Every structure is written in C-alpha cells, then in structure tokens.
Amino acid sequence: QFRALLFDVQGTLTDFRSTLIEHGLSILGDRVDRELWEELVDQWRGCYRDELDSLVKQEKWRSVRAVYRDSLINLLAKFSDSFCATSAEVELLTDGWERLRSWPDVPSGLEQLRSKYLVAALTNADFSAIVNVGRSAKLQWDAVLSAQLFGAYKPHRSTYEGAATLLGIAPSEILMVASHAYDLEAAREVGAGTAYVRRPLEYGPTGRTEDVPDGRFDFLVDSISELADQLGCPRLG
Amino acid sequence: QFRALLFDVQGTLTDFRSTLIEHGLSILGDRVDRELWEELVDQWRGCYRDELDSLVKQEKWRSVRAVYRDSLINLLAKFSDSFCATSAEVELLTDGWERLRSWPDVPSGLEQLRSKYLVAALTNADFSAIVNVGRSAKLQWDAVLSAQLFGAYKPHRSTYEGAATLLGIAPSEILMVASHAYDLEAAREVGAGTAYVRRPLEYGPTGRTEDVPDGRFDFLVDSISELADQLGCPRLG
C-alpha cells in the first residue's frame, strides 16, 4: 500500500497551545492574566491561518516565523490598553512556537512506524522551525520537508507532489497524516492516502475540534501508536 | 562555537566500496568473479567522480541516480565478454548506492554529538537516495539536505549557503565534516569550520587515500566519536 507517511506537525503531533500559554505567562508575569493571555493565543492562531490562507490564493510564500511575529505585533496593539511588550519580549514570545512539546503518544508511535515505513514531516513552518521543534517535541524523522523548500504552502498541490518527487515515490504511495481535514482533503486530490488524528485538547481543555465520522478518511485514530497498529506495525518493547 | 554539524555522507560516513562489492556479488552470483567485480566498482566510482567534476564546472545539476545508472550501462558493455545483466538487474545493481553501510564508529558517534549539536546531512546524492542510505547505514539526522534541493553540487558555495539558510544558522556556526578535502576547503570559503575524517579503506585495502597534515583543517580525527570528544561531547552509556 504505502511507502511513506507524511506528517502534519503543529497540532497533529505538537501541543502548541499549552506551550504558548505557559511560555507567555512566564515571560509577561503578573502583567497578564490567564483568560487575557489565552484569548490572545487563540486569536494569534487564527491570524496565522488567515494570513496563510491569503498567501495560498495569491500563490506567494514568506517566512512563517515572520507571519507569527507580524500577527502577534498586531494583536499586542489591540491589547495596548491592558499591557505592553518590548521588542525583545516579542521575540521571546514568538519563539514559543519553536519549543512545542509533542502529545505523549507521538515519539513511541513514530518509532513504531519506522519499522515498515519511511516517516517524513511536511510542514508549513519554516525549515529551521521544524528542525528546532524536533528537539523539544522529541521528533525523529527520515526527512524534514517544509513549505520553504517548495515556495508554497499546503493545501497547494505543489507541496504534496514535490514531497513525493523528492522522496522518489508516487503520491499514491504516501499516507498523509494530520489532525486538520483541509490538509487531508488536498492530499486526497493528488492521490495520497488519508489518516486523521483526533486531538481533543488541540484547542484547549474547552473548545472542540472536528468530530470526524468514520469513512471520511482511510483511517481515523486517537494516537500515532494506534495508526501504527492498523498499518501492521508491531508494538515496541 | 558551533550550533550544527554538516556531514558529507558517501565515504565520510559510509563504506560504499564494500557495500557495492557484496551487493553486486549477491545479485550476480557465479556469473562474475570477485576480483573482476571489484574492478568494475572501482571504475564505476571513478566515472561518477569525473562526471560530477565536469557538471560542477559547467554549473549543471542532474539526477545522481541517473549518473550511476548511465555509467553502469557503459561498464557492463565494456565487461560484456565476462558477464551480462538484465534490465531489471541493472536497476538492482544501481540500487546498491542507496543501501550503503556505515563505518562502525558512525552511528554511536552521531548519537553522541546530538546532545550538544544539530546534525544534518549535506550530500550530492539525490534526496531519495540519502533518505534510503539513512536506513541501511543507521544514520539519524535532525535534517537531510541534498544537492537536488539547490540545483547545484558541492563544492558550489550555493550548497553550503543554502544549507545555512535552511537550518537558520550562521555559516560561522557550522562545522563541516568530510573525508574529502575539496568539500572542506569550499566550506571554509563560505565561513564554516572544518573537520577532516581519515578513511584509509575508502578506496579499498589496496589503492590510496589523501594526505592531510595536522593544522590544515580545524579538526583531524580517525572517527566521528573522536571528533565528538574534541568538541566537548560527553561519552554515551
């Protein structure tokens, strides 16, 4: 069936929200409260995807770190009555995105898959960012692929097809793995397999995610270890 | 001093000659004698080098797999009196270059360096080839980089500069590691440190290797683990 598994990373494998909440509360200290900062974090994620959505239609690529920084600065202006931050603090706050921890199933799941499949990241994050998160989130890849290599973000066909060309495999022999349906739907359009990972805590203990029904994608799992089971990979020691 | 180590792979970390000799004898069996096959492998490697030297001068890039395949077809014609190969066998023999075994020091040496440094591959081999070599050679990277990503082979400055921009690290904070002096000299020009790894068996128990004196490059070692020691990395368990 498949030769390689292509992974979305942010949210799919990493809990970005907990880190950005705790990191921002560490940096800003007594100057911001949980509900103020949590509301900021949630609008920040929206601003990034809205800018990335705009860039895809326009067929342009830019530093994704710069996207995060630009949208944070815009949000800090909105909240300028409540608190402020220096340029250095804006840099440290923006760095939170590159210190993500992975969900607890991920490292054992990724290793268990490596016995039958090549495992690569295909991320919209900049190349250096995914390399950096790899250390804090304990990710170990066969290859790292980023929108920066292709000059185009997912859901663009160029990213999935370029990933397949670089890997030397037909798109039909890629299983694409993601906790975001848009990413899986685009991969299906190039012939790739689809595997959805439910992440109920991706947007916090409250706040819900897509209750995906069975049969929309080829697999629907609650962990990478579970996906590995269904792909004929044995459990580790 | 250094944030990342950039590794050449073929030869520096992998014994391509032992691999291709035993790989060919497995495919061809009794139809060729070992000493004859050894002569083809040594000329095959020579063809590959002469071809890459000319493509570098012309500033062109082409699939390195096709370089191996086209040069093999020429040598099979030259040796056609002694043995022959089917079209399928030509593909299998060319696959040997994507199944290289690593020198015995390398896997633990790479692991020991990961405690303090980012480790990435930078090879002239195509992207799919270096991914496959990671399994056969048991290499574990933070990132994998290929001349295919840049449309230019080492020693072109664009390859070292592209790697630095992809990893987000200043070339002065990159240590280049190789058993080939051309590669280290070119990285020195871009601003990186240099580490020469002596591989006397790279071209066989017979044949010869390069002369590097002490003080020509920043480090001169006999194994990756020695390099890690000289870089302040604690030993493994």
Residue numbers in the entry:
A (entry chain A), B (entry chain B): 11 to 247
Provide excerpts from the study.
Two molecules are present in a crystal asymmetric unit, and gel filtration experiments showed that both enzymes form homodimers in solution. In RhCESH[L], the key residues involved in hydrophilic interactions include R124, R145, Q150, and D152, while L128, F137, V141, L159, and L176 participate in hydrophobic interactions. Furthermore, similar hydrophilic and hydrophobic interactions at the dimer interface are also observed in KlCESH[L]. Interestingly, an intermolecular disulfide bond forms symmetrically between C94 from two adjacent RhCESH[L] molecules in the crystal structure; however, the aggregation state of RhCESH[L] remains unchanged in the presence or absence of DTT, indicating that the disulfide bond forms due to crystal packing. The core domains of both RhCESH[L] and KlCESH[L] can be well superimposed (with an r.s.m.d value of 0.944 Å), while there are some notable differences in the cap domain. Although the previously proposed catalytic triad of RhCESH[L] consists of D18, H190, and D193 (22), D193 should not be the catalytic residue in the catalytic triad because D193 does not form direct interaction with H190 in the solved RhCESH[L] structure.
Microbial epoxide hydrolases, cis-epoxysuccinate hydrolases (CESHs), have been utilized for commercial production of enantiomerically pure L(+)- and D(−)-tartaric acids for decades. All these three CESH[L]s exhibit high sequence identity (>60%) with L-2-haloacid dehalogenases, which are members of the haloacid dehalogenase (HAD)-like superfamily. Studies have shown that both RhCESH[L] and KlCESH[L] adopt a two-step catalytic reaction mechanism by 18O-labeling studies.
